[PDB]
């Protein structure tokens, strides 16, 4: 049951936009809402509006009086001397709650005229006509206007609606909540050479009487929220999908072949999401818009998605096809379960984020294989256990503070830190995988189909929300639908992993009792760390003995420590028979390293990742080597690679080398075995016999049979030896001699890989392989032996580093004339120059990176150069570079770059709270408090980034470096 927090119900909204002026960055328009009051004596009506100048408001064609105030413009007063962050977080939460449409509130308060009170008490319709104007928007609509001359379509100028969550208040007045569903009528009067893309279906396109402008009329009969309404106006090249004909793809001019190749996969994503769920795609059209200077890499609205143009690749670009493919896939998953089925509160957001991430993981499983699915699930689980042990924990479904261990309030999406938002979505889809583990996948897809079917029977009624609230899901409704389809309720699993905000830590060690033939496990939990919680459920453990692989369920109550499980025979060591594996197959194992008295080959605690856990198991090194070689699970091979770094014995070198030589191993395991072999080789110097590690293996796999030092000409058509070939010198460059310097046998090998590179014969580009070659050249740089702080000049350069510097100069200059796909070699060469500057080789001068961080460059070059400037101002304690970065945060045209500068200055801070630094003035505290209070008031993501930066630099209490 859904009861509105608003005293009115909104039925229909007309959004008309005229006079989109690109020179002056200005729009004019009106908005006409059709509300039905649910309570009599409505009097004031409270709507949401930011940055719009409200000209006039007429209610039922009668002139009404409005008052506007935004408390989130300046959160705390300018003349308050408070400088602690808990004060700002409480004031910012109160300010966002005072404009919240999820309460009754709002920023624009319109007073109902007196003569309509007899129209409002007996509950009859009210039609509110606001007309507004955005004079030069700092948020919401982003105007990308290039400075080439010509007409606005000839120079490539466009507008798009940017922002996250409820940010539609930034470009027209609305009820900007996900729970106020209404039908829509959208008119946009644009230039005749431009096209206006928006939500709904385009019913017509009429000309103006001078035929210089045309009006696009859109209609949206599926009741969506105001937060799902978008806009993209530009000189877009239109491409109808040749497979599905209601799907149109819009790109920027001159990028039509890239659009043709890139969006050619999307019909398979449509077919997948419509056959695992049994509902068809709910909207009547689908539109993909590719734009410049995007807010996020992929945004999903109702019947529309806005991607950045940096996803567009051609047919000869690999290492970008899977990333763009999965961006399209998660946009479509959010089309199904973020835009059609919406949110009932700010709680129950974990339901939608979990269903979107879970069905996108099912797509990844079918498309890229079960092994890529397991690797992705393991990397997400490692991400969340790292974040939750780092700071507190992520609390899905809080109850309204519920989480007081962290420096922001979790009551609203616009007060969350961006890393918390990312980990929120990550934990939501892992908890949905856990619900699939308890209640099987076919019942899970039946739950999702029941939600979609209730929403689509709801979506066709005309009753104003008598039935339109069946399109809003809640937690209680989701659990009730689960209990309807399965008969089991998941309330212990919901109580543990949703309502409780923690992950578990397992420390395991075993001992084999030879007398009674049992395996005595010893599993203890660390439940006193700040991020942890105590697990009391069951726990699966998989033991591989000589007779095969056996699963055991252990009951781990609070007082439990020793778990005795039984062991089988050892009669497959009496005769040589094959040892049967986890799957149905069996292999020949070399049992010379195994103990004579124990049959068990390896043990895995929680193999299926059925809890949110971090396992620290103490096996013997031969058990880790057997688990690396003969396991049929990629997460166990990865964890054995990760645990073999502590055992540098030559049997582990043989194990990793046999993994590296082995095709029919998953390629991301061999790419990890490269770096593990490099670390082991560095640890057993003065024992290593022959050549450096992986060199003979590289010449055996990727070089000519007649010439060992000449590499084969590039043929990248295998896509697994391409990735292994481009990752093996990067790990090989981490080799070090007894003198702690990279050997001149590996550096010469990398330089010969660079010289003899011929790419005139493959059908694929070479930009990522050459960029990884520059990364391998950067890995070999050891710190220089400066004497008496000698100035680093050209004559006293290292003889090794002069070759590296010549190569990166040649590569960067050749990129200036023949550019790569996304300037990958510019990014790699800037990263390598920063590596050479971090050691004492090149003079520590930020002027090159400051010239590459200007506005007109590509955004990857910009963020690489700004990362180098952030690293410089951390190491050299530069005041003027920090003022340069803070000025670039305040006034840069691209808001993604501002968010990225705040992000990089949070990750690599110039000082922490423990450090005494020269950059701990009252001036810097006043600048960052002014940046939290004012200055970042237009983005909701810059303000949370400024809160994160103030927390990283000064902590939760009063800045110490202050009177």
């Amino acid at each position: 049951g859904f009861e509105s927090p608003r005293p009115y119900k909104l039925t229909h909204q007309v959004v008309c936009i005229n006079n989109i002026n690109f020179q002056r960055k200005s729009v004019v328009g009106f908005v006409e809402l059709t509300i039905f009051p649910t309570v009599a004596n409505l009097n004031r009506i409270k709507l949401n509006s930011k940055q719009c100048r409200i000209y006039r408001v007429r209610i039922n064609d009668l002139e009404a009086a409005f008052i506007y105030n935004d408390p989130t413009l300046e959160v705390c007063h300018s003349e308050s001397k408070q400088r602690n962050l808990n004060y700002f977080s409480n004031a910012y939460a109160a300010a966002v709650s005072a404009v919240d449409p999820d309460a009754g509130n709002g920023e624009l308060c319109i007073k109902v005229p007196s003569e309509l009170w007899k129209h409002v008490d007996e509950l009859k319709v009210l039609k509110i006509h606001i007309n507004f104007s955005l004079d030069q928007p700092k948020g919401g609509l982003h105007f990308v206007v290039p400075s080439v001359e010509g007409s606005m379509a000839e120079r490539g100028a466009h507008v798009f609606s940017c922002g996250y969550q409820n940010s539609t208040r930034f470009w027209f007045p609305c009820v900007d909540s996900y729970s106020e569903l209404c039908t829509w009528k959208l008119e946009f009067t644009v230039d005749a050479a431009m096209v206006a893309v928006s939500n709904g279906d385009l019913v017509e396109t009429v000309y103006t009487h001078d035929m210089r402008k045309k009006t696009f009329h859109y209609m949206l009969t599926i009741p969506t929220a105001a937060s799902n309404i978008s806009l993209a106006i530009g000189p877009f090249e239109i491409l109808v999908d040749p497979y599905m004909h209601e799907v149109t793809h819009f790109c920027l001019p001159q990028l039509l072949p890239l659009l043709k190749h890139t969006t050619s996969y999307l019909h398979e994503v449509f077919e997948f999401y419509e056959e695992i769920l049994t509902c068809r795609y709910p909207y009547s059209c689908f539109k993909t818009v590719f734009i410049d200077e995007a807010y996020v890499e992929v945004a999903a609205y109702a019947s529309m998605s806005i991607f950045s143009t940096n996803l567009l690749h051609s047919a000869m670009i690999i290492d970008e096809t899977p990333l763009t493919r999965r961006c399209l896939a998660q946009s479509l998953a959010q089309q199904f379960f973020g835009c059609f089925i919406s949110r009932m509160s700010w709680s129950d957001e974990w339901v939608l984020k979990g269903i979107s991430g879970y069905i996108y993981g099912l797509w990844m499983k079918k498309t890229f294989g079960v092994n890529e699915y397991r690797h992705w699930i393991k990397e997400e689980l490692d991400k969340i256990v790292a974040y939750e042990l780092k700071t507190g924990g992520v609390l899905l479904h809080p109850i309204f503070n519920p989480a007081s261990h962290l420096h922001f309030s979790i009551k609203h999406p616009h007060t969350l830190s961006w890393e918390y938002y990312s980990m929120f979505q990550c934990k939501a889809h892992l908890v949905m995988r856990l619900i699939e583990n308890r209640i099987s996948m076919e019942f899970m897809l039946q739950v999702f189909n029941k939600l979609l079917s209730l929403a689509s029977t709801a979506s066709s009624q005309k009753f104003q929300s008598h039935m339109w609230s069946q399109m809003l899901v809640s937690t209680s409704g989701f659990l009730k639908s689960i209990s309807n389809v399965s008969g089991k309720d998941i309330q212990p699993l919901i109580k543990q992993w949703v309502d409780q905000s923690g992950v578990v830590k397992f420390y395991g060690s075993f001992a084999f009792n030879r007398k009674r033939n049992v395996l005595e496990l010893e599993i203890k939990q660390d439940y006193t760390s700040p991020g942890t919680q105590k697990y009391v459920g069951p726990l699966k453990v998989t033991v591989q003995e000589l007779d095969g692989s056996f699963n055991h369920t252990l009951q781990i109550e609070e007082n439990s420590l020793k778990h005795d499980i039984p062991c089988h025979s050892k009669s497959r060591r009496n005769k040589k028979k094959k040892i049967p594996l986890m799957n149905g197959e069996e292999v020949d194992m070399d049992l010379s390293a195994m103990d004579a008295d124990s049959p068990l080959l390896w043990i895995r605690i929680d193999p299926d990742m059925s809890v949110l856990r971090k396992v620290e198991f103490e096996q013997a090194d031969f058990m880790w080597q057997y688990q690396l070689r003969y396991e049929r699970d990629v997460v166990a091979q990865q964890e054995s690679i990760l645990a073999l770094e502590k055992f540098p014995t030559p049997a582990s070198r043989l194990a990793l080398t046999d993994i590296l030589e082995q095709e029919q191993c998953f390629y991301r395991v061999r790419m990890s075995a490269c770096f593990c072999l490099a670390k082991i080789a560095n640890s057993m110097v003065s024992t290593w016999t022959g050549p450096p590690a992986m060199k003979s293996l590289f010449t055996r796999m990727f070089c000519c049979k007649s010439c060992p030092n000449i590499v084969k000409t590039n043929n990248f058509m295998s896509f697994q030896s391409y990735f292994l070939q481009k990752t093996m010198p990067v790990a090989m460059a981490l080799l070090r001699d007894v003198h702690n310097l990279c050997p001149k046998e590996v550096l010469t090998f990398i330089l010969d890989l660079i010289k003899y590179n011929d790419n005139r014969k493959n059908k694929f580009s070479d930009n990522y392989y050459r960029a990884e070659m520059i990364d391998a050249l950067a890995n070999s740089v050891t710190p220089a032996v400066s004497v008496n702080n000698e100035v680093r000049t050209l004559d006293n350069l290292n003889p090794d580093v002069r070759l590296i510097l010549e190569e990166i100069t040649r590569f960067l200059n050749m990129e200036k004339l023949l550019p790569s796909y996304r300037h990958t070699i510019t990014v790699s060469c800037l990263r390598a120059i920063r590596v050479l500057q971090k050691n004492g080789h090149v003079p520590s001068d930020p002027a090159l990176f400051k010239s590459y961080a200007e506005y007109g460059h590509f955004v990857d070059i910009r963020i690489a150069a700004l990362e180098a400037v952030v690293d410089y101002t951390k190491v050299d304690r530069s005041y003027e570079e920090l003022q340069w970065l803070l000025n670039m945060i305040q006034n840069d045209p691209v808001p993604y770059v501002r968010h990225k500068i705040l992000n990089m200055l949070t990750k690599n801070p110039p000082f922490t709270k423990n450090m005494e630094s020269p950059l701990c003035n009252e001036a810097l505290v006043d600048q960052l408090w002014k940046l939290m209070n004012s200055g970042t008031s237009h983005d909701w993501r810059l303000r949370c980034g400024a809160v994160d930066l103030y927390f990283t630099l000064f902590g939760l209490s009063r800045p110490s470096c202050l009177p």
């Binding site: 290039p146 580009s765 010239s851």
Partner: peptide, 25 residues
């Protein structure tokens, strides 16, 4: 300037056209 000269970075008015577009096709 004699040893390791770098061509100076010039800003483009539209940078995606010189980044994303293929030149040999």
């Amino acid at each position: 300037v004699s040893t390791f000269p770098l061509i100076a970075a010039r800003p483009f008015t539209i940078p995606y056209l010189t980044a994303l577009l293929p030149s040999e096709l």
